[PDB]
Amino acid sequence: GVIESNWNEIVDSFDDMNLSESLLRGIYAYGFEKPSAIQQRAILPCIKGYDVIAQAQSGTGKTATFAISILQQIELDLKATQALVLAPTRELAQQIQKVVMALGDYMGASCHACIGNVRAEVQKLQMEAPHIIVGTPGRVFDMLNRRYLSPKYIKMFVLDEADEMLSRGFKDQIYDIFQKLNSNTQVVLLSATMPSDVLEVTKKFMRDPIRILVKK
Numbered sequence: 001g002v003i004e005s006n007w008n009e010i011v012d013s014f015d016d017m018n019l020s021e022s023l024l025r026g027i028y029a030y031g032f033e034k035p036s037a038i039q040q041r042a043i044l045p046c047i048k049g050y051d052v053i054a055q056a057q058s059g060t061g062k063t064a065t066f067a068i069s070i071l072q073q074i075e076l077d078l079k080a081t082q083a084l085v086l087a088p089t090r091e092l093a094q095q096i097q098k099v100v101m102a103l104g105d106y107m108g109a110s111c112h113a114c115i116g117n118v119r120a121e122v123q124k125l126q127m128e129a130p131h132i133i134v135g136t137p138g139r140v141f142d143m144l145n146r147r148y149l150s151p152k153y154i155k156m157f158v159l160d161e162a163d164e165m166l167s168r169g170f171k172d173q174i175y176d177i178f179q180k181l182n183s184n185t186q187v188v189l190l191s192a193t194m195p196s197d198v199l200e201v202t203k204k205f206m207r208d209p210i211r212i213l214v215k216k
Contacts (some may be wrong), residue, residue: 001194026106036061137173
């Protein structure tokens with residue numbers, strides 16, 4: 001489905017995004033060069049704290065867009081979970097974790113994956129509360145529900161591939177997680193398609209959002 005863009009800024013260089021020096025070092029050590037259209041448009045309003053709706057296809061640079069925005073906002077000495085990322089699958093959740101960790105490794109920002117027969121992961125969380133959790137909706141709601149994860153400091157909530165998550169039956173978990181977050185929480189939703197039930201999430205959970213369409 002199709003949204004209309006509404007934001008002004010475009011930034012063609014990661015040098016120009018006001019990133020912390022070691023975040024930038026981390027981005028370049030990883031092998032990113034110049035920002036793609038999504039990164040040029042969306043990184044700055046995400047870091048500014050605005051609700052963002054980004055419609056962009058796969059292969060366009062989304063992961064790095066929110067990985068970078070999230071890492072820039074982290075209060076590094078606040079040993080607490082500060083940002084939550086939802087993905088429709090475990091492999092996509094792990095891939096997101098491996099970008100965030102590889103950039104965060106230059107700043108000392110921690111990131112844990114929260115996925116579905118090993119539940120020793122549900123203990124070990126009791127070294128650090130990680131700064132960033134990435135997970136699938138059932139698993140993340142489980143940890144909120146049973147209080148292994150605290151919503152108290154979560155002040156960034158990212159929904160990657162929102163359409164896929166709805167298609168996979170995750171609307172109750174997502175809404176339940178929404179209800180458990182602080183009313184003040186920044187929401188970033190990314191999706192290739194924007195059908196009405198995706199849009200309804202944006203209507204229930206976002207306020208005066210930034211709208212970015214990257215055309216395929």
